[PDB]
Ligand binder design. Structure first.
Ligand SMILES: O=C(NCCc1ccccc1)c1nc([C@@H]2CCCN2C(=O)c2c(Cl)cccc2Cl)[nH]c(=O)c1O
Ligand SMILES: [Mg+2]
Ligand SMILES: [Mn+2]
Ligand code: NA
Length: 178
């Protein structure tokens, strides 16, 4: 599965995932399922931000902590929206709201509730994807057009199928916790 991650994801995504794991004392070569999950969430965040028009989204995920908060605090001062307690994943300039992106190996409704209870940021918009084409967004408001969403869901399904063809999926599928 370490080989799978390194050939499947772009090298900057892989480097970011490695850093994120090591910042919590985890070895990407050992906790390989976690390695893959972080890479997938990152790739989805980047795909999401490419989904609209140029300049529609600001990417917050994937930045070091100081720059990420400089972006958040800047947006809050420029648009007046409330400052979140946790770093979200994107800001949407069209809808003027932060977005929290979730990618789950379990079911989208359970993950949605968990995310909602965890952030408790009434104003942050939540959008969840699964590896089997399901999604769940706040107020059933999905932000992107169906073509963009289809691209994301299609990529997640491809990853899922690739893992399965290597007998890695069932270990990966059961590795997520609440
Ligand atoms: O922004 C995120 N993380 C900010 C930093 C952070 C770090 C720890 C706890 C809270 C926040 C973030 N994180 C996760 C999931 C659940 C929380 C951890 N995690 C990871 O992927 C993960 C990371 Cl980052 C590093 C090592 C191991 C893991 Cl398992 N899911 C998201 O959708 C998401 O946006
Ligand atoms: Mg995040
Ligand atoms: Mn997220
Ligand atoms: Na989070």
């Amino acid at each position: 599965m370490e080989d799978f991650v390194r050939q499947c994801f772009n090298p900057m995504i892989v480097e970011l995932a490695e850093k994120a794991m090591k910042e919590y004392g985890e070895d990407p070569k050992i906790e390989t399922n976690k390695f893959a999950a972080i890479c997938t969430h990152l790739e989805v965040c980047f795909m999401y931000s490419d989904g609209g028009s140029k300049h529609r989204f600001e990417i917050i995920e994937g930045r070091d902590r100081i720059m990420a908060w400089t972006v958040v605090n800047s947006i809050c001062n420029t648009t007046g929206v409330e400052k979140p307690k946790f770093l979200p994943d994107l800001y949407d300039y069209k809808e003027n709201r932060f977005i929290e992106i979730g990618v789950t190996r379990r079911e989208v409704h359970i993950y949605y509730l968990e995310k909602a209870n965890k952030i408790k940021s009434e104003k942050t918009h939540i959008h969840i994807f699964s590896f089997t084409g399901e999604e769940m967004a706040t107020k059933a408001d999905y932000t992107l057009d169906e073509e963009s969403r289809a691209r994301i869901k299609t990529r997640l399904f491809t990853i899922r199928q690739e893992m399965a063809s290597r007998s890695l999926w069932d270990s990966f599928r059961q590795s997520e916790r609440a």
